[PDB]
């Protein structure tokens, strides 16, 4: 298992514009298009992202290309973030995948807002961090995915995904 296969399991793959759990226009592998309610604003962003007139539909390859960009940007954002970098540096390879997963879903700002949990992760207090991570809107809104991520932080294995 690796970051790509983990996120592919959490986000799925859809070749036609769809709405995410929050009601936002998305496509491919969890690629947010816009928070705007306009499907046209969404089609426009889509075409801008792909470099072609898509009419709201893309191919597998195109979906995978967006996915590669997004994971790269996620990693780079973490390493550029003063709050995230130290946590990330301190972790093992599996747990690093967990931070990347959160960043991809909720953005660097969002994750950086998990002050207390981050401090617990850095101190390697696994059980305590898992309990604190669960007291969040995140966990309440997408409980099955959050439990998976949380288990990864708690155990340091890919069990939740197997």
* Dihedral sign of CA atoms 141, 145, 129, 109 in order: negative
Question: What are the phi and psi torsion angles at 40 (to 5°)?
Answer: -75, -40
User: CA angle 73-161-123, nearest 5°?
Assistant: 65
Number of residues that bind Cl ion (CB under 5 A): 4
Shortest Cβ 33–Cl ion spacing (Å): 9
The correct pick among 81, 142, 151, 155 for binding Cl ion (CB under 5 A) is 142
148 binds Cl ion (CB under 5 A): no
Shortest Cβ 58–Cl ion spacing (Å): 12
Considering the complex, state which of residue 49 and residue 78 has its C-beta at the smaller distance from Cl ion: 49
| Pair of tokens at residue 57 | 């539909």
Shortest Cβ 89–Cl ion spacing (Å): 27
What track of x and - describes contact with Cl ion for positions 78 through 117 (by CB under 5 A)?
----------------------------------------
The correct pick among 7, 27, 42, 49 for binding Cl ion (CB under 5 A) is 49
Question: Annotated binding residue at 90?
Answer: no
Binding residues for substrate: 32, 104, 117, 132
């Amino acid at each position: 298992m690796n970051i790509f296969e983990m996120l592919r399991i959490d986000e799925g793959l859809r070749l036609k514009i769809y709405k995410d759990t929050e009601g936002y226009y998305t496509i491919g592998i969890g690629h947010l298009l816009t928070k705007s309610p306009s499907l046209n604003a969404a089609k426009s962003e889509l075409d801008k992202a792909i470099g072609r007139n898509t009419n709201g539909v893309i191919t597998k390859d195109e979906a995978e290309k967006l996915f590669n960009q997004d994971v790269d940007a996620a990693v780079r954002g973490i390493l550029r973030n003063a709050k995230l970098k130290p946590v990330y540096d301190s972790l093992d390879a599996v747990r690093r995948a967990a931070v990347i997963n959160m960043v991809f879903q909720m953005g660097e700002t969002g994750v950086a807002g998990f002050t207390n949990s981050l401090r617990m992760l850095q101190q390697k207090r696994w059980d305590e961090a898992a309990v604190n991570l669960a007291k969040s809107r995140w966990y309440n809104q997408t409980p099955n995915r959050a439990k998976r991520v949380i288990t990864t932080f708690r155990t340091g294995t890919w069990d939740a995904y197997k």
